[PDB]
Amino acid sequence: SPHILASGDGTNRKPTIIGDVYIHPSVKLHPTAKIGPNVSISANVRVGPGVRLISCIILDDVEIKENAVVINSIIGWKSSIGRWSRVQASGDYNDRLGITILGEAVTVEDEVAVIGSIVLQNKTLNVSVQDDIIL
Amino acid sequence: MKALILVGGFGTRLRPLTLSFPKPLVDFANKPMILHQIEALKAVGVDEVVLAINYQPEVMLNFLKDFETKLEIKITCSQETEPLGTAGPLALARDKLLDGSGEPFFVLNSDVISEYPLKEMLEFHKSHGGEASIMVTKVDEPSKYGVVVMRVEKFVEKPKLYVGNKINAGIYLLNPSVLDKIELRPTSIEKETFPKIAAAQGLYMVLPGFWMDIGQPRDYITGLRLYLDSLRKKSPAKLTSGPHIVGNVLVDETATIGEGCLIGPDVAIGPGCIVESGVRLSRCTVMRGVRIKKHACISSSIIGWHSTVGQWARIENMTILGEDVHVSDEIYSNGGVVLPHKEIKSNILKPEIVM
Amino acid sequence: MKALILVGGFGTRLRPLTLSFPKPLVDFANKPMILHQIEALKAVGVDEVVLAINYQPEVMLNFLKDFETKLEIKITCSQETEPLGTAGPLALARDKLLDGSGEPFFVLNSDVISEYPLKEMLEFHKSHGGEASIMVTKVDEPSKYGVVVMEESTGRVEKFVEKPKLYVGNKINAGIYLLNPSVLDKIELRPTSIEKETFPKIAAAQGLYVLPGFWMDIGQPRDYITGLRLYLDSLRKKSPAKLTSGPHIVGNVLVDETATIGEGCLIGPDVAIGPGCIVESGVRLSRCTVMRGVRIKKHACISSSIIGWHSTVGQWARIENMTILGEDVHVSDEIYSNGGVVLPHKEIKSNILKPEIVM
């Protein structure tokens, strides 16, 4: 049953879907975003334009701003990803920091970068972090 | 009126940008570094300019020949076998500096930037009738530099106690009556020649502008701020403005910018460039012909000639790219000093020199 | 008889030695890498040789023109717009390979060294009357390579098993071929990898058919010190009078007639000094290679390193642990290097006490 999986593969108000994507019907999307492989989007989430989503899962009530990038990440609930901000990781399922994890209602400000780190819930980030565990 | 510019070598400390083009041919804020002081020498009506280089000029003859007609200035080279300190290269070029009228000539360093008020310096020379003139700028760290205790008197290098804060700025103004006091042995103008005229009390200005010693590739982003800042004062209509422009941005007429971008602050895009949509430039400098693809985020970096930044690629933290470097899409670089003619298909997640 | 040599690109993975001279122009054991198999093609009487390069030959025309008269061989270049897989460059040079006699031509790779027994391979070709011939060498690790499953009775291959988790064989390709003109038609206009698409096409037809020497894939500058051992070892067998000897010599050393050595030195094992070099007194060379024109000053101790052209090692300087120097690198006296990959035209006045890339 792939019809349960989003298979847009175009731009007829549907974004560029690159296989193995589950999109909830309650999401808000922009056709300029490229939703890459292995991404599972939840309900009531606002997806920005020209954003790249591969190898990640996004929870409910997340706000993705202008030109954001998410690689090997897990975005928590009610989280806010600022514009031109990047949240990536290596993808090593054996390393502890191989998959960057964001807590509940974490606000990554504009241009702020998070590379392979773990952020707790209800946290604001004005500065870029790297290879750490932010409480 | 004549002039001489001390260049030095090829720019070993400026690699990989000086691996192909020499130090003075590197485009700084759209224009090559050599044109920043040649046009300033035309403001005082200098016809001939000599270069005290150490390498062979055979690689830049096409560049120096194309600037002689555009700027209406005579440009000739002088090549020395060995570096003769700091005042040696001037002893060789004394034949091209004496026109017979006995007028003072300028000596400039290629590793220094400023506002260059050369016009109001001749009046500072033709008023008291001095023999030699240098320029001086205030610095917060006088111990790390050579302090000038001012008419000047003595040279106190690395003063443990405070004797002054004023240091040399690398720009000089010398009468023809000084080209005889030099010896044939390599002599440093800062350690031997200047004290010879200071004890003679036959010399005598404060620099009302910015000063920056460019000796490393990372100083280009912080030195471009001091340049673009002075441009906001001198001529504010030379810096582009708009709804997608923030701060001071110097765009070329040949460069084309896509829609949905955000450029600034302190970004200089060379000619022949094509910037795509969704980009975010800040504190960086873009050289000629390089294409940056869509949705890229570049901050505080240096882009070489005819390179290529893929889509959704993030570049930050003093990442240095050579000529013709192709960054794949979705690639992240955190301070990767990359060699020219290299295809980047993996993330440089930490500072690393790639070949 | 004709021949074709696959070069590839400029040698990006061999920098900083290939920043100026291209990959085949790097001096390996005194001689450039290209001369090791061109003279071997003269052992079988090959008149014309074509190079399947990808860059512009304008930088090496002067070098190839001086080898046509010294070796009495016709050398022409072929430049492709794109690398066309592995068999593509052969489709472009088919016009320079067909002389009319329909004789088999050789196809060689620049990234491989061996003993090259080309003479006794034609007899291995003119005996059973096969159409295509390849060479095969045994490896201890067949999983990291592409295994060729042949029968141990005649020499016919059957299938290609890359990365076999279980044991299906240990014999892999060596990068040297022998093809009749009747194969230049089976290729398409599309970039095809000869190892993945073309070779299986002839194996299923059963119309095709071991290397008794050393094999080395030189794809990194550190392979020059370990590949030179295999070369000098084969020289101890082929012609042992070509390797210099003496009271200050240990192991296998290949010195040039132009190179000069001071007194009280100790060189070896596995050291190759190019021509025009100037070795001073009291030096200790071991497992290293010296290229042209570089002078090593007195009391220097160099172990397992690579010296570029026209460099200069100061007195009492210690160089070890795969230290790579570019062209015209001036190391001051008493300087220590522990794996410093230095760019050409650089003066080293500080110790490289740990592996570090200097520009």
Side-chain angles (χ1 to χ4, degrees), chain A residues 1-13 15-135, chain B residues 1-47 49-154 156-170 172-301 303-355, chain C residues 1-47 49-105 107-140 142-151 153-194 196-359:
Chain A
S1 64
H3 40 269
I4 80 161
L5 290 203
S7 36
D9 295 70
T11 37
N12 324 328
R13 255 193 169 246
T16 27
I17 287 156
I18 327 291
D20 258 19
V21 183
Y22 170 78
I23 286 181
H24 194 277
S26 185
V27 315
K28 176 177 291 294
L29 302 177
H30 197 282
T32 57
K34 182 178 280 185
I35 321 296
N38 186 18
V39 46
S40 311
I41 326 182
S42 298
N44 289 93
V45 58
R46 294 199 298 260
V47 168
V51 306
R52 188 82 176 99
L53 307 176
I54 69 183
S55 308
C56 57
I57 51 178
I58 301 172
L59 297 182
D60 296 299
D61 229 328
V62 181
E63 181 178 351
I64 306 292
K65 283 189 175 182
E66 317 279 355
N67 300 322
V69 183
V70 177
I71 321 292
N72 295 318
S73 315
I74 302 182
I75 308 300
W77 320 82
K78 285 78 177 181
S79 307
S80 184
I81 298 304
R83 52 185 57 91
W84 287 293
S85 51
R86 191 187 186 98
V87 183
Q88 68 158 30
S90 0
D92 194 22
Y93 303 100
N94 318 320
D95 184 16
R96 198 180 185 185
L97 300 185
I99 301 298
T100 169
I101 302 168
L102 261 58
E104 176 193 4
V106 47
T107 65
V108 176
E109 216 158 351
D110 317 321
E111 290 193 21
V112 179
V114 178
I115 297 92
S117 294
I118 310 302
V119 186
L120 267 59
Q121 72 280 1
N122 317 322
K123 200 68 182 187
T124 167
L125 293 180
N126 56 327
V127 65
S128 299
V129 300
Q130 175 184 347
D131 303 330
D132 204 335
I133 303 179
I134 289 87
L135 303 178
Chain B
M1 189 171 297
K2 299 289 186 173
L4 173 65
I5 298 181
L6 297 174
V7 180
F10 216 80
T12 60
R13 36 202 55 246
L14 290 77
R15 292 192 173 100
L17 301 179
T18 52
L19 270 180
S20 301
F21 293 152
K23 177 171 57 177
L25 287 191
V26 175
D27 289 14
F28 171 72
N30 286 259
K31 288 155 196 154
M33 259 306 298
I34 194 66
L35 297 190
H36 292 82
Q37 299 88 6
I38 287 184
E39 192 273 346
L41 289 172
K42 239 300 179 295
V44 291
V46 173
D47 9 316
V49 178
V50 187
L51 302 179
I53 68 179
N54 191 77
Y55 61 95
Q56 64 292 338
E58 311 143 0
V59 298
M60 63 187 187
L61 286 181
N62 284 327
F63 290 87
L64 307 179
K65 202 174 307 176
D66 297 332
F67 298 154
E68 286 187 307
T69 17
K70 178 188 59 182
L71 302 177
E72 287 185 338
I73 277 186
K74 186 61 176 300
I75 300 177
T76 55
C77 296
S78 67
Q79 182 183 3
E80 290 75 7
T81 54
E82 291 72 41
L84 308 174
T86 329
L90 287 78
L92 182 139
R94 69 143 65 184
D95 45 2
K96 298 297 296 182
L97 288 174
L98 302 187
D99 56 330
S101 177
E103 285 280 350
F105 54 91
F106 287 92
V107 182
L108 305 177
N109 195 332
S110 182
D111 307 9
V112 187
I113 52 174
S114 68
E115 311 192 338
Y116 299 98
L118 301 177
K119 296 218 59 58
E120 300 181 358
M121 192 184 316
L122 277 70
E123 190 176 21
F124 188 61
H125 186 77
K126 294 185 177 183
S127 182
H128 53 13
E131 183 200 3
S133 182
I134 68 174
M135 289 303 294
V136 172
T137 174
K138 50 166 184 56
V139 295
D140 303 331
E141 295 281 348
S143 63
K144 302 177 60 179
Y145 308 138
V147 184
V148 177
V149 279
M150 55 187 291
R151 192 180 308 175
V152 319
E153 301 178 352
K154 206 62 176 59
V156 182
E157 70 285 355
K158 185 51 188 60
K160 286 190 73 217
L161 236 75
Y162 178 81
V163 293
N165 39 253
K166 305 133 298 174
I167 73 160
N168 195 314
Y172 309 140
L173 185 154
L174 290 172
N175 273 331
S177 302
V178 78
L179 293 175
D180 65 329
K181 211 185 192 312
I182 36 81
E183 38 159 15
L184 39 99
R185 307 297 316 121
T187 163
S188 321
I189 199 178
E190 300 283 349
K191 312 178 185 304
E192 290 83 6
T193 301
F194 281 159
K196 281 183 177 182
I197 323 177
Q201 308 284 48
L203 28 57
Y204 62 94
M205 184 187 171
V206 184
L207 175 63
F210 63 96
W211 182 87
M212 174 67 64
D213 192 314
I214 301 93
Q216 56 193 20
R218 62 184 53 84
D219 287 353
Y220 274 143
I221 56 182
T222 180
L224 187 125
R225 174 49 137 182
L226 300 182
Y227 175 76
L228 286 190
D229 187 15
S230 181
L231 258 58
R232 238 48 234 241
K233 324 165 181 140
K234 297 305 191 34
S235 42
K238 305 276 117 186
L239 306 91
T240 184
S241 177
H244 65 289
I245 300 298
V246 285
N248 304 341
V249 178
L250 178 57
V251 125
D252 192 297
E253 56 185 359
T254 319
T256 166
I257 298 182
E259 298 289 347
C261 309
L262 195 52
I263 299 96
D266 306 292
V267 183
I269 301 179
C273 310
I274 309 179
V275 170
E276 297 194 351
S277 284
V279 305
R280 172 50 174 155
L281 303 181
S282 50
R283 203 186 160 88
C284 53
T285 83
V286 166
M287 292 190 185
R288 304 179 51 177
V290 46
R291 164 193 302 191
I292 299 179
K293 293 183 180 180
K294 286 177 276 189
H295 311 145
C297 178
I298 303 191
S299 40
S300 58
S301 294
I303 315 300
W305 302 283
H306 306 92
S307 296
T308 294
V309 175
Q311 296 179 2
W312 289 285
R314 182 181 181 94
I315 307 298
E316 68 176 5
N317 190 20
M318 302 170 301
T319 306
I320 309 299
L321 299 187
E323 174 185 353
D324 181 68
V325 176
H326 298 260
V327 181
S328 299
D329 305 335
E330 317 162 22
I331 300 294
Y332 169 76
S333 293
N334 191 31
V337 188
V338 187
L339 267 61
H341 307 294
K342 188 63 180 183
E343 295 184 336
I344 303 303
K345 301 188 176 184
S346 302
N347 301 334
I348 311 180
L349 23 77
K350 287 177 62 61
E352 175 186 346
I353 296 176
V354 183
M355 327 184 56
Chain C
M1 189 171 297
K2 300 290 185 173
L4 173 66
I5 298 181
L6 296 174
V7 180
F10 216 81
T12 60
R13 37 203 56 246
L14 290 77
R15 293 191 174 99
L17 301 179
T18 52
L19 269 180
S20 301
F21 293 152
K23 177 172 57 178
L25 288 192
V26 175
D27 288 14
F28 173 72
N30 286 260
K31 289 154 196 154
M33 257 305 298
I34 195 66
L35 296 189
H36 293 83
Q37 75 289 309
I38 286 185
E39 192 273 346
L41 289 172
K42 238 298 176 296
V44 290
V46 173
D47 4 324
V49 178
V50 187
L51 301 179
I53 68 179
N54 191 77
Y55 60 94
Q56 65 293 338
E58 310 144 0
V59 298
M60 63 188 188
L61 286 181
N62 285 327
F63 289 87
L64 307 179
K65 202 173 307 176
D66 298 332
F67 300 152
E68 287 186 307
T69 25
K70 179 188 59 181
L71 301 177
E72 288 184 339
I73 277 185
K74 187 61 175 300
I75 301 177
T76 55
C77 296
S78 67
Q79 181 184 3
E80 290 75 6
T81 54
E82 293 72 42
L84 308 175
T86 329
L90 288 78
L92 182 139
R94 69 142 65 185
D95 44 2
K96 300 299 296 182
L97 288 174
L98 301 187
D99 54 330
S101 177
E103 285 280 350
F105 53 90
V107 182
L108 306 177
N109 194 332
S110 182
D111 307 9
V112 187
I113 52 174
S114 68
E115 311 192 339
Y116 301 100
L118 301 178
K119 297 218 60 58
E120 299 181 358
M121 192 184 317
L122 277 70
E123 190 177 21
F124 188 61
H125 186 77
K126 293 185 177 183
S127 182
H128 50 20
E131 184 199 3
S133 182
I134 68 175
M135 292 305 295
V136 172
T137 174
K138 50 165 184 56
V139 295
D140 304 331
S143 63
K144 302 178 61 179
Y145 307 136
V147 183
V148 176
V149 279
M150 54 187 290
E151 81 279 327
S153 62
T154 54
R156 192 179 308 175
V157 319
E158 301 178 352
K159 205 62 176 59
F160 61 105
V161 183
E162 69 285 356
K163 185 51 187 59
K165 286 191 73 217
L166 231 75
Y167 177 81
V168 293
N170 38 256
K171 304 131 298 175
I172 73 159
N173 195 315
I176 153 182
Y177 310 139
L178 185 154
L179 289 172
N180 274 332
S182 302
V183 77
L184 293 174
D185 64 329
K186 211 186 192 312
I187 39 83
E188 38 160 15
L189 35 117
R190 306 297 318 121
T192 160
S193 321
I194 200 178
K196 314 178 185 304
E197 290 83 7
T198 301
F199 282 159
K201 280 183 177 182
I202 322 177
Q206 308 284 48
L208 30 59
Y209 61 94
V210 184
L211 174 63
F214 63 95
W215 181 87
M216 173 67 64
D217 192 314
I218 301 93
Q220 56 193 19
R222 63 185 54 83
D223 287 353
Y224 275 142
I225 55 182
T226 180
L228 187 126
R229 173 49 138 182
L230 301 182
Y231 176 77
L232 287 189
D233 187 16
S234 181
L235 258 58
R236 243 41 243 248
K237 323 165 181 140
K238 298 305 191 34
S239 43
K242 303 275 116 186
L243 305 91
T244 183
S245 177
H248 62 289
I249 301 299
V250 284
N252 304 340
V253 178
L254 177 57
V255 120
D256 192 298
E257 55 186 359
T258 319
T260 166
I261 298 183
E263 296 287 347
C265 309
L266 195 52
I267 299 96
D270 303 292
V271 183
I273 301 179
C277 309
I278 309 179
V279 169
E280 299 194 353
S281 284
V283 305
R284 172 49 175 155
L285 305 182
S286 50
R287 204 185 160 87
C288 53
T289 83
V290 166
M291 292 190 185
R292 303 180 51 177
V294 44
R295 165 191 302 191
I296 298 179
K297 292 183 180 180
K298 286 178 276 189
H299 311 144
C301 178
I302 303 191
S303 38
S304 58
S305 294
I306 301 290
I307 314 300
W309 297 37
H310 307 92
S311 296
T312 294
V313 175
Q315 297 178 2
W316 288 284
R318 180 180 181 92
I319 307 298
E320 68 176 5
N321 190 20
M322 302 170 301
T323 305
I324 309 299
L325 298 187
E327 174 186 353
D328 182 68
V329 176
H330 299 259
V331 181
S332 299
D333 306 334
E334 317 162 22
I335 300 294
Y336 169 76
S337 293
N338 193 31
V341 188
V342 186
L343 266 62
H345 306 294
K346 188 64 179 184
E347 294 185 336
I348 303 303
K349 300 189 175 184
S350 302
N351 299 334
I352 311 180
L353 26 78
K354 287 176 62 61
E356 176 186 346
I357 296 176
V358 184
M359 326 183 55

